[PDB]
Every structure is written in structure tokens, then in C-alpha cells.
Design a protein around this ligand. Structure first.
Ligand SMILES: [Mg+2]
Ligand SMILES: [Mg+2]
Ligand SMILES: [Mg+2]
Ligand SMILES: [Mg+2]
Ligand SMILES: [Mg+2]
Ligand SMILES: [Mg+2]
Ligand SMILES: [Mg+2]
Ligand SMILES: [Mg+2]
Ligand SMILES: [Mg+2]
Ligand SMILES: [Mg+2]
Lengths: 293, 170, 159, 213
RNA sequence: GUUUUAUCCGGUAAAGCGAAUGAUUAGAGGUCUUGGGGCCGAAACGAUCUCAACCUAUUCUCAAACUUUAAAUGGGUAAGA
RNA sequence: CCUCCCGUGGAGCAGAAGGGCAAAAGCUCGCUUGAUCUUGAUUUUCAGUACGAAUACAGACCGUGAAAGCGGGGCCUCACGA
RNA sequence: GUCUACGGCCAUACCACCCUGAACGCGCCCGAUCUCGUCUGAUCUCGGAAGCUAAGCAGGGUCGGGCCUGGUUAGUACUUGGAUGGGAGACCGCCUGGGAAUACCGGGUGCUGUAGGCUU
């Protein structure tokens, strides 16, 4: 070329790489510093954050506090363990986000032994609710939402998970502006379409809307809903009994697997002797090719 | 034999009309683009002030709009019909996407209107493969990798197979 | 004839090290500072708030007050022929724990454990660390090898 | 018009280069630093002879110009215009100043003496250390005496003490003359113009197989 | 107005410029261009010769208000009731 | 003007220079008035006086943000008066 | 032996190109009724699950560049303290202690914390 090579030797010599998770595009350190750092006059009082991460096929809800050697996770809930009871299809939606936030809330409260107190909002409605600490009793668990790189506009599944947790009984500071019920025009919160979103009524309306226009498009969209026959009329009761089962048993038990032979699926790193031998063989073969001409 | 995830396809079409000045001419050009695309266009301010072209900084100069999907396919079809399905060898960039220009906007479908000029325009189609969106996504963005890229030769070949075009030795 | 600006002569003092610019690592915030512990004041330039003055860069002091983002440090400053204990408010980005104190307290704990163990097992043991003693008598074997004879090399002009 | 060089012989100041702070510097007297057959290849001129300072001092650009001219004239006389290549290894980067006084019969005429005494740029000199090379001449191996005489004649244009040294390197390269031939044979060195390129045994093997081919 | 043992602090001397920022010498190898042009090329400089600019790998010499690296001397703290 | 690719910042951050900064401290939007009411402590010049400027708090009342938080002028070093 | 989520240190981790990827996963992918944003459902937000490892990603490779760490450079350069040492000076040697940096030549190419999966 005739243009200066921008990425020459000196460019790499002076290049400073960013943090590993910044390069991976996973952690916003500007938000993390404000989010995980405790006041110095609070010393070793942990600062709890509820990490919510919505995946292409899963929802991860975790509660963690920062330490020097790394974040310490005290409770984790996933949307892939929702099929253990109630909802089995249509995960990674708003209703499953509410369910997994509620499951995380109940599981953490059960681990800490605060269940009879801080029952949360058992009767589900979309209106705001904030648990209040009972005097003479252990205080309500307080954590702060970690949305990550998600765009926190109205109707986000991270706020669905937050609503699930605050209905489960955690004291998470929030507002109703980002719930799906909020009207950005009149600056008002409907608190009923939010309950519809929590119970998955929008998805059911989509199903019965697709049925009346394009049946094959309905099949293509809700293909797995057809399997095991999840229908719009029973979706809300499915979610209600899923919430009931979450409240009934939030304890997680692990799945054991140890009878696995130690098989390696990766190529090991070559040794220095092997690399030198490879270079020598390549030189010899090149000279052989020349002498054969 | 060929992975279905490697198929070339049009990402955007990126129509652009660069009227020299602002005002009624620019408004009529915006009406032209909206009529052609069925889609509201946007204006472009002038980055600097140049006396030779007689434009001031922050003055609305051009109008443009990006079109994606089947509408992009149809608009590109009309533009190439006007171009007689022939393009110069140098009309293709080294990044795998290309473009051309149309002198009069009424020879492609749109009928003349007396309250509308004879505006010309620029087509610049951007090719792509499934998975190019990872360079634009917010969380865990990354580059596409060398084999997944599109070369000038591949763009020319795709033009020849799809629109049975002629690559003139320009 | 010198200006009295707060940051005169800090061009390299408050500049970042090579290829260590950008985001401040979060362990510096995750450290814990109690009252009475010993900290070194450094003063990085990425954080412009709560900066120490240039006369406290490289000094070492004792923490007496802890706030949300800073600490109060009692640090000795020499002015003419007197040393006075100044009290400075410094944000935690500009400080770190002094390892001399950590090593000393580990030594104290280890010496107390040694006293307990030695009183358990009867035999006395040495705790005061002594300076480097003179080398003791020893034999140096030749291993049947005559030592190499060394002579100075002749001079020659090189370049 | 110019002060005696004894006034600026010693390195008394910090280096004062021509920069954005030292403005208005007149051009140096020496503009050409390489003479003779500069295009000659490496093997053409095996012998290299340097002239090496023995004093930490300042050499003026005028002195460098005079010595270059003298050595060039003698080398052209003895070895011919294509038989040698000379390189001046000192560049006059240090600006020397002058606090000009009015050279009339009056001190009342705004002379001010030592007030505001910082001076205007007088000229440029080069700083040379003990052991540093001032001039280099490379040529055929049989012109050793001519090189020595040219450097001896050039010595008289400089203030201090200088030595003449027939270096052990091949030409202007940094490799020893006795080890040069076999290194070129085994392709640790590749000629290019007046110098050679050292080819280490690391890098891509494509650069190795463009060699040996 | 001291050493020792731990432990931090620094950007001077030196060094570097085939490492950034400025300064600067010479050749070498490539191929685009409003470089000159080039001798027989208008004719498709049918051609390809030279000099530019540019790029690449090198090369000579430098910095109080340049720097990756980086001393000696030096500054702080600790060595318990 | 429009499009793609490279781009460690070689731009910008009011101004002198130096430092600092990249899903920043830069650019563009949205909402705003913490450039507000208060008491002390401290740092800088220093005599350890003042002014100026600054740092960390505490008590009000607010702003913004979903929130953690951040904000009592300007990213820091000057821009002032018994 | 690995991956996911959140990380600590922040290139032994970066950059360029090539090869391989079982299972979960992560992704690409499909769509725009609802939530929400656009000139454009490209990004963002939402509802999904036909196909695919082509890309991201992971592991490996390159007499690779860089980076990290050694050897050399070199007890050299520089330097604390000393002398009624040398020299016209410039500067230099010695005594007493400390002691570098290029070029050049080697080796290495992330380690690890918490929680949860996959691997007969
Ligand atoms: Mg944010
Ligand atoms: Mg005279
Ligand atoms: Mg002087
Ligand atoms: Mg200094
Ligand atoms: Mg120096
Ligand atoms: Mg340089
Ligand atoms: Mg307050
Ligand atoms: Mg401020
Ligand atoms: Mg390498
Ligand atoms: Mg010595």
C-alpha cells in the first residue's frame, strides 16, 4: 500500500488494552463502580445487588456482593428451572422474568430464614408495593437492581424481574415509571396492564390474534406452545399456580453427575521441541523441493 | 455444500439526494424520496461552510433515507432496470458493497408532478451475510471474522448471479 | 519568583504510569480502612477530587477519620526546623495500605505464638532479630580443580 | 563578524537545540554530510577509518565544514572522485548565543551592561564526547595511508585533540571485517546500498524461504 | 543531623530514538499520482527509461521546557506494654 | 452529502501550558437549577495570620436517574480585595 | 476437559491470518400483536424456536508482530564519600561503597474467585 500502516510495531508497543470484561463487552465499569462500592464508613457491610441478565433462551437472576477476589453470589435463580413446576414453555418473556425474580426472592428469603415474616404481595396485582421492615424482627433484605448493558426503557424484562422480587419480599428501591403499565403521555401508571403482562396476557392475546388471521403463521410462531398444549385461556392459571408453587417450595437442590471419564476435547498446547522440529522439517522439505526442482 | 448462513443479502439501500441548497428545492426532494420509498426521509446539514459551493455550516443541504428488506429489493430492482443491469468494474468497493446513480427520478416508476422537479439520486446498496449485526449489537459486540467478510469479487459475482448483470471494464 | 499554584511541578508526579491510564481498578475502592491503620499517600491524577497536596505524595500517615469516600490522615510534615502533624482529607483513590505495618503485625503475632509454643515445650528461643553477623569459619573445597588464573587484559581502542 | 571559537569551545551550558522555544536560529554552515561515491555498495569499500575526539568540547559548524572540505579535497586528489565515501558523524544541534554590545565610544547609549543579558542565537555547534567519532572515510583497502593523511589534514581545522583510528568494522557497518564475508555467505547479512541488513533467525518462514531461493 | 531490617515515594545522571512527540543524514526496494517527463512513445507514454512525491525495511546524529526503561545519593513510615 | 472498513485517541473538553479522560470528563438529546440555605473541621501561601481558592463531612431544601448514586458551579492547576 | 452469569488482577489476556469444536450453554436466527424506540424492528424493546456453527465465542497453530520474563550489553555508563592525585586546561585515573538502559540472544503466551450447567 501507499498509506502509512496505522497498526505498525509502535502502535502495538504503545497500545493499552482495556479491562478483559470491557473488551468482551459484558461489564460497564462506569456503572459498576457506582453500583458495587460501599461507603468507607460502613466498612465490611455487604452491598447487595440483584443482577438480572436476559439471554436469548434464558433469564439469570442473581444476588451478589463485591469482594476483592471477586463477586460473591449468595442466591441464583434461572428461567430454565421454571419447568420444574408450572410454566414449561415460553421462557425468557416478561411473565417468566416475574416468575424467576419471585423464585430468587423466595429462595433467598428461605435461605436467610425470613419466610413467615416478609411474605410479600401474595395476591398479585400490577400496582406498586414496597415491603416495610417489621420492628422487633430482622430487617427486610435490601438490594439494588443491576441491569447491566440493557436499555432500561419502559417494559423491560429486567424490571419484570424486579417486580417479581419486590413481590417476593425484597426491599429494592424502584419506581413504576419503567413498568409496562406506565403511560408516557399522561405520566400515569395503569397498574392493570402491568398485571396482564405479569400473567402473560399479551402473549395469549398474540396467540388468539394469530389464530384468527394466519393459522400457519401461528404454528410457526408458537410451535413449541402447541407441544404439550399450552393455550391462551389457561396461560394465566398456569402462571398463577407457578407462583403458588414457587411460594410453596423455593429450595434448590443440585443435580449430581460424577460418573464421567476424564476425556479431553481440546488440542493441548504444542511443546517447544515439537515447534522446533516442525520448523526444521519445513526447512528440510523446502530445500528438498528446490533440489528436486 | 455451501453453508446457508453464508448467503449474501442486501442489508440497506441508502438512497441519497444532494440538493445544493436548502428551501423549497430540498422540500420537494424530500417529497420525492418519501413518494418513492413510502417512508419519511431525513435531511443532512452541511459540516462546513464553503463559498465555492455557496453553503453555510449547519444548513440543510441533502436528504437521504435507508431502506431495508423487500422494499430495498424492489427499489434496487427499479434502479438497476434504469441502469439496464450494467455496472462499471469500479462501481464496487473493496468492502463488498456497491452503488450507482440515477439522473432522473421519474424514469423508475414514479410519475412526474408539476410541483416536483427532475431530481436525480444515489443508490448505494450494502451487502451482508447473516451475523453481520454482531458488529452493531450493544452487549458483547465483535468483529465478523475474515472468512465471513465480502470481497469485491464476491459482490460482483453476486450481482452477476442474481440480477444477471454485466460488469463493464470501466 | 516561583508561582504558588497547588499543582506546580506535578507534571510527572500526578501523571499515570505508562499504559496504565483509563478506568481505575475497583479493588482500590474495595479496600477497608479502619481508624489507626497506616496508609501511604500517592495521589493518582485520574481522580481530581480529594487530591493530596504534592508535599504529601510519598508520605505515610495514620488514619483517624473515615467518611463515605475519603479518610482523614495524620501525616508528619517538616516545615523549616519543626515537624508538625498535619491532618488531611484524602479520597481513597490516592492511598493504599502500608505493608511495613502489615509485616510488623505478622511478626508480632508470630513472636507471640513462638513465646506460647516455647513456654509449652520448655526450651528458650530467640525473638529479637539480630543484624547480619560476621561470616563464620568454613572450608572451601577445590574438588581437585586448580583455581583459574586471572590477569588483566591489554588495552585496545574499540570505538 | 564571528567570535573566536575559544569563546564557545567548552560545553558550559545545557543543550540548547533549535526548537519552538529557540527561534530565529541562523542556518548551520555545514549542510552536506556525505561525500564521495555514496551509492557504492558495501563490499566495494571495505576499509573504514574514523577520526575520534579525545576532548569533551564543542565543534562549530564552520569548523566541521572546513574539515569536510579539506578531507574531500585530499581524498579527491589521492583516490579519485569515485574512490572513497566520507560521512561527517556530527550534526550542529546546539545553538550558541551572543549578548551583543554596542561597539562604539559610549556606555550611556542604552548599553545597560549585564541587564537583560540573555543573548540572541549566534550560531550552531556540535557537542562531541571523549571517544566519539567526528568523521568517517570508507574506501578500498589499499588507500589506508591516503585515508590517514586526509584525516590528519582535517585534524588541523578543529580546536582540541583528535586520534585517527582504522576501525575493525567492514566499511560503515557495525559488523567486524573478518566476520563480514562468512556472515554474508551464510546470509546473516543482505546488502542494500551503502549498508547491510541483518537477518535474524526469527520471524515468519516465508521471509526465510524468499531467501535461499 | 547514625546505621540495620522491612516497606513505600521520585523521573535526575545515564540511556533511547530500527519506541511515542519534536529535530535530522544517507543510500536501498516497491508501485499509484495534476511530479518533472521521455530520448523513436501522440496513436492503448504502442513502450518503459529517468527524477519526484508516497510507502516499506534499514541507516548517521540529537532534546532544560521529549520519552518506553532507569540508577547513586535522597524523602516518609514501622521495628510493641 | 451518502455508505462501508481501519482507526489508543494522533480529536474534543472556553482560554496559556501541563496533567486527566473513550459505552469518558468528549458529541447529541431529555429533564432541570447543588451557581440554593447553614455551622464547624481541614488543605494550599503560611508567621502555620488573613484574603482567595480548594478538599472531606454534617444539617435542610431540591434536581436527575428505574436505581445504586451523583450534584452544593465550570475535569484539575489562575481568573481577585481589609 | 470445558462453558454460562457476575467478577479480581488488567496483553503471559492484545493484534493478524489458519485449523478444530462432542454435550449443555452462549450465539447467530425468525417475527412486529403487545411494551418500547427508530429515516429504516439495522440498533433498542418485545414474542419466539424453522435452520446454522458460516460468524461471534472457546481451544490450538505461526522459525508471526506485540507483551511478560531472563542472558548479554556490563561491573560498562552513571554515582556517595577521599586525597597537597595527574593535567595549562578540557577533563582523566585511583581509593571507598552502590550500579544501569538499547541493539543482540533465549524462554513464555493468562492466572483465578463465587454460583450454576455439560461431559459414561
Ligand atoms: Mg447506565
Ligand atoms: Mg580579537
Ligand atoms: Mg551557562
Ligand atoms: Mg523535574
Ligand atoms: Mg541526558
Ligand atoms: Mg524519535
Ligand atoms: Mg447535603
Ligand atoms: Mg470540581
Ligand atoms: Mg514472537
Ligand atoms: Mg566508583
Amino acid at each position: 500500500g501507499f498509506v502509512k500502516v496505522v497498526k505498525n510495531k509502535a502502535y502495538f508497543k504503545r497500545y493499552q488494552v482495556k479491562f478483559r470484561r470491557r473488551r468482551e463487552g459484558k461489564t460497564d465499569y462506569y456503572a459498576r463502580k457506582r453500583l458495587v462500592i460501599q461507603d468507607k464508613n460502613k466498612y465490611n457491610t455487604p452491598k447487595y445487588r440483584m443482577i438480572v441478565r436476559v439471554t436469548n433462551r434464558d433469564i439469570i437472576c442473581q444476588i451478589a456482593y463485591a469482594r476483592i477476589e471477586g463477586d460473591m453470589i449468595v442466591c441464583a435463580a434461572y428461567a430454565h428451572e421454571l419447568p420444574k413446576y408450572g410454566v414449561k414453555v415460553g421462557l425468557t418473556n416478561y411473565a417468566a422474568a416475574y416468575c424467576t425474580g419471585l423464585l430468587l426472592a423466595r429462595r433467598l428469603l428461605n435461605r436467610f430464614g425470613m419466610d413467615k415474616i416478609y411474605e410479600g404481595q401474595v395476591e398479585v396485582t400490577g400496582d406498586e408495593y414496597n415491603v416495610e421492615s417489621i420492628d422487633g424482627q430482622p430487617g427486610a433484605f435490601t438490594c439494588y437492581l443491576d441491569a447491566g448493558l440493557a436499555r432500561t426503557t419502559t417494559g423491560n424484562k429486567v424490571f419484570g424481574a424486579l417486580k417479581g422480587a419486590v413481590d417476593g419480599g425484597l426491599s429494592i428501591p424502584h419506581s413504576t415509571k419503567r413498568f409496562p403499565g406506565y403511560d408516557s403521555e399522561s405520566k400515569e401508571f395503569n397498574a392493570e396492564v402491568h398485571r396482564k403482562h405479569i400473567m402473560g396476557q399479551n402473549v395469549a392475546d398474540y396467540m388468539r390474534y394469530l389464530m384468527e388471521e394466519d393459522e400457519d403463521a401461528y404454528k410457526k410462531q408458537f410451535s413449541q406452545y402447541i407441544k404439550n398444549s399450552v393455550t391462551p385461556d389457561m396461560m394465566e392459571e398456569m402462571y398463577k399456580k407457578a407462583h403458588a408453587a414457587i411460594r410453596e417450595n423455593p429450595v434448590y437442590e443440585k443435580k449430581p453427575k460424577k460418573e464421567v471419564k476424564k476425556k479431553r476435547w481440546n488440542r493441548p498446547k504444542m511443546s517447544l521441541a515439537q515447534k522446533k522440529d516442525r520448523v526444521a522439517q519445513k526447512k528440510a522439505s523446502f530445500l528438498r523441493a528446490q533440489e528436486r526442482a | 455444500k455451501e453453508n446457508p448462513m453464508r448467503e449474501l443479502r442486501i442489508r440497506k439501500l441508502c438512497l441519497n439526494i444532494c440538493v445544493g441548497e436548502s428551501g423549497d428545492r430540498l422540500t420537494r426532494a424530500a417529497k420525492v424520496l418519501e413518494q418513492l420509498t413510502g417512508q419519511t426521509p431525513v435531511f443532512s446539514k452541511a459540516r462546513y461552510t464553503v463559498r465555492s459551493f455557496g453553503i453555510r455550516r449547519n444548513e440543510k443541504i441533502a436528504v437521504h433515507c435507508t431502506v431495508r428488506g423487500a422494499k430495498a429489493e424492489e427499489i434496487l430492482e427499479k434502479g438497476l432496470k434504469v441502469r439496464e443491469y450494467e455496472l462499471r468494474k469500479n462501481n464496487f468497493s473493496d468492502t463488498g458493497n456497491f452503488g450507482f446513480g440515477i439522473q432522473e427520478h421519474i424514469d423508475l416508476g414514479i410519475k412526474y408532478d408539476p410541483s416536483i422537479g427532475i431530481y436525480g439520486l444515489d443508490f448505494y446498496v450494502v451487502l451482508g451475510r447473516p451475523g453481520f449485526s454482531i458488529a452493531d449489537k450493544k452487549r458483547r459486540t465483535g468483529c465478523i471474522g475474515a472468512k465471513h467478510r465480502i470481497s469485491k469479487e464476491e459482490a460482483m459475482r453476486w450481482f452477476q448471479q442474481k440480477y444477471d448483470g454485466i460488469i463493464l471494464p470501466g | 519568583t516561583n508561582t504558588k499554584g497547588k499543582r506546580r511541578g506535578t507534571r510527572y508526579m500526578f501523571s499515570r504510569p505508562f499504559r496504565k491510564h483509563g478506568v481505575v481498578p475497583l479493588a482500590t475502592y474495595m479496600r477497608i480502612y479502619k481508624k489507626g491503620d497506616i496508609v501511604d499517600i500517592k495521589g493518582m491524577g485520574t481522580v481530581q477530587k480529594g487530591m493530596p497536596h504534592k508535599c504529601y505524595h510519598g508520605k505515610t500517615g495514620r488514619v483517624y477519620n473515615v467518611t463515605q469516600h475519603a479518610v482523614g490522615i495524620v501525616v508528619n510534615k517538616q516545615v523549616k526546623g519543626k515537624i508538625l502533624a498535619k491532618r488531611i482529607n484524602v479520597r481513597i483513590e490516592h492511598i493504599k495500605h502500608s505493608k511495613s505495618r502489615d509485616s510488623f503485625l505478622k511478626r508480632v503475632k508470630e513472636n507471640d505464638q513462638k513465646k506460647k509454643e516455647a513456654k509449652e515445650k520448655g526450651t528458650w528461643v530467640q525473638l529479637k532479630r539480630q543484624p547480619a553477623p560476621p561470616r563464620e569459619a568454613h572450608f572451601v573445597r577445590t574438588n581437585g580443580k586448580e583455581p583459574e588464573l586471572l590477569e588483566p587484559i591489554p588495552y585496545e581502542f574499540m570505538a | 563578524g564571528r567570535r573566536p571559537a575559544r569563546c564557545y569551545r567548552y560545553c558550559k551550558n545545557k543543550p540548547y537545540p533549535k526548537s519552538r522555544f529557540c527561534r530565529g536560529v541562523p542556518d548551520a554552515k555545514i549542510r552536506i554530510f556525505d561525500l564521495g561515491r555514496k551509492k557504492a555498495k558495501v563490499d566495494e569499500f571495505p576499509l573504514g577509518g574514523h577520526m575520534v575526539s579525545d576532548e569533551y568540547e564543542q565543534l562549530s559548524s564552520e569548523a566541521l565544514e572546513a574539515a569536510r572540505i579539506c578531507a574531500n579535497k585530499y581524498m579527491v586528489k589521492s583516490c579519485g572522485r569515485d574512490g572513497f565515501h566520507m560521512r561527517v558523524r556530527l550534526h550542529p544541534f546546539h545553538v550558541i548565543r551572543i549578548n551583543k554590545m554596542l561597539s562604539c565610544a559610549g556606555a550611556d547609549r542604552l548599553q545597560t551592561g549585564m541587564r537583560g543579558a540573555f543573548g540572541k542565537p549566534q550560531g550552531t555547534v556540535a557537542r562531541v564526547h571523549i571517544g566519539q567519532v567526528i568523521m568517517s572515510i570508507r574506501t578500498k583497502l589499499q588507500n589506508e595511508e591516503h585515508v590517514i593523511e586526509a584525516l590528519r589534514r582535517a585534524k588541523f581545522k578543529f580546536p582540541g585533540r583528535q586520534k585517527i583510528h582504522i576501525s575493525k568494522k567492514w566499511g560503515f557497518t557495525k559488523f567486524n571485517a573478518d566476520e563480514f564475508e562468512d556472515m554474508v555467505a551464510k546470509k546473516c547479512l543482505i546488502p542494500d546500498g551503502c549498508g547491510v541488513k541483518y537477518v535474524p533467525s526469527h520471524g515468519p518462514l516465508d521471509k526465510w524461504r524468499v531467501l535461499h531461493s
